[PDB]
Amino acid sequence: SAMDDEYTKLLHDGIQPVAAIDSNFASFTYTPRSLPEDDTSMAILSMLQDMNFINNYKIDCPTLARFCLMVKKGYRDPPYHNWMHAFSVSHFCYLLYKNLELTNYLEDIEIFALFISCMCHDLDHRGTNNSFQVASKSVLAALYSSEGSVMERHHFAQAIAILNTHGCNIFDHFSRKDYQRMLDLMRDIILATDLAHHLRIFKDLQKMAEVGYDRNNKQHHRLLLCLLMTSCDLSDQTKGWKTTRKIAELIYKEFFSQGDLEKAMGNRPMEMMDREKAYIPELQISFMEHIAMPIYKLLQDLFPKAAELYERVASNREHWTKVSHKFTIRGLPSNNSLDFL
Ligand SMILES: Cc1nc2ccc(C(=O)N[C@]34C[C@H]5C[C@H](C[C@H](C5)C3)C4)cc2n2c(-c3cc(OCC(C)C)ccc3Cl)nnc12
Ligand SMILES: [Mg+2]
Numbered sequence: 001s002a003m004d005d006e007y008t009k010l011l012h013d014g015i016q017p018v019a020a021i022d023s024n025f026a027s028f029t030y031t032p033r034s035l036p037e038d039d040t041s042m043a044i045l046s047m048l049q050d051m052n053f054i055n056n057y058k059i060d061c062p063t064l065a066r067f068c069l070m071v072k073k074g075y076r077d078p079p080y081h082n083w084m085h086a087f088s089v090s091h092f093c094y095l096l097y098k099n100l101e102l103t104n105y106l107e108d109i110e111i112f113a114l115f116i117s118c119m120c121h122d123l124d125h126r127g128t129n130n131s132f133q134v135a136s137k138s139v140l141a142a143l144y145s146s147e148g149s150v151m152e153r154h155h156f157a158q159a160i161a162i163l164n165t166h167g168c169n170i171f172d173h174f175s176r177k178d179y180q181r182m183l184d185l186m187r188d189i190i191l192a193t194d195l196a197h198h199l200r201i202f203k204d205l206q207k208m209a210e211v212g213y214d215r216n217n218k219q220h221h222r223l224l225l226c227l228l229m230t231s232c233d234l235s236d237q238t239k240g241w242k243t244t245r246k247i248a249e250l251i252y253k254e255f256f257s258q259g260d261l262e263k264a265m266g267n268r269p270m271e272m273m274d275r276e277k278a279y280i281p282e283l284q285i286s287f288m289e290h291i292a293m294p295i296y297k298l299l300q301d302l303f304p305k306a307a308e309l310y311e312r313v314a315s316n317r318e319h320w321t322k323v324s325h326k327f328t329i330r331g332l333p334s335n336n337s338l339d340f341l
């Protein structure tokens with residue numbers, strides 16, 4: 001009855017103005033993880049309203065309220081891949097809309113699909129990666145390993161199962177063509193969140209940025225959607241040092257738990273997943289330099305107003321260098337004991 005009462009309030013109390021959430025809510029400086037989790041479903045509705053999706057697509061309010069709650073409920077509680085991750089990703093999507101004028105690049109339905117996909121893009125994550133599904137012979141690998149992107153195929157299927165739950169299909173009044181289009185977009189966008197996919201299309205993303213975005217080019221729309229999605233997924237890096245440091249802590253707790261499971265199964269975990277080997281500053285510098293920074297550089301190349309995003313990610317990368325020396329124990333530990341040897 002908890003979800004029941006939550007739904008009742010979401011529906012009958014009305015959608016709070018986005019400004020009432022926080023005065024800097026639509027700024028790139030805002031940290032959505034600062035929002036209490038109990039306020040996040042209402043904030044999703046607020047953002048949807050402010051982007052005019054509810055009016056433009058005549059979304060049924062009861063259905064939308066149920067959908068948002070079901071999506072939130074469809075996340076488990078690992079250290080990083082939980083609802084607060086999906087919420088913050090979705091918030092960054094809203095920030096791109098508010099700050100970068102997406103309507104000059106993308107169709108309305110494409111922006112709508114990007115935001116809905118942000119909400120659903122890690123549904124039912126179990127705190128382990130694609131490699132672990134295959135190594136552990138999980139049910140997800142049995143279903144999808146032959147296709148690849150095992151977890152991302154699962155996330156997308158979970159999103160569809162929510163839509164297919166009675167009372168939850170926010171698109172069910174759509175035309176046949178628009179419905180098919182929306183689900184196709186969600187497939188493409190969610191599958192774009194596999195790092196393997198990003199690596200595959202990276203040269204194409206570069207070539208798009210250098211020749212220039214062509215709104216009449218259907219391939220450019222698809223590539224831009226992939227880039228924007230990956231920008232949202234990594235958007236914790238575009239905030240202050242405190243956010244970056246906290247997210248590293250959640251990510252490596254999640255990783256080392258997987259690593260401990262791999263050790264128990266007799267397998268040699270990835271080094272970044274092995275708490276006995278992993279050197280966090282060097283790992284994060286490598287992630288920032290090889291993955292995060294090139295993505296926000298592409299974003300800047302395509303959207304000059306995204307410059308501050310790249311500069312912040314580069315700044316956070318430099319901070320890891322600055323604090324790395326603190327991972328060396330100098331003098332004695334605080335307890336004046338060398339017992340830990
Ligand atoms: C702060 C931070 N650090 C990270 C450090 C390492 C890795 C990570 O998975 N690295 C490897 C390890 C192995 C060898 C390489 C290929 C894969 C196996 C992944 C790199 C990811 C990190 N990460 C993510 C992240 C992003 C995801 O989707 C990414 C798409 C959307 C682009 C999926 C999962 C995560 Cl956890 N979000 N934030 C972070
Ligand atoms: Mg994912």
Ligand SMILES: [Zn+2]
Nearest residue numbers: 085121122233
């Ligand atoms: Zn994610």
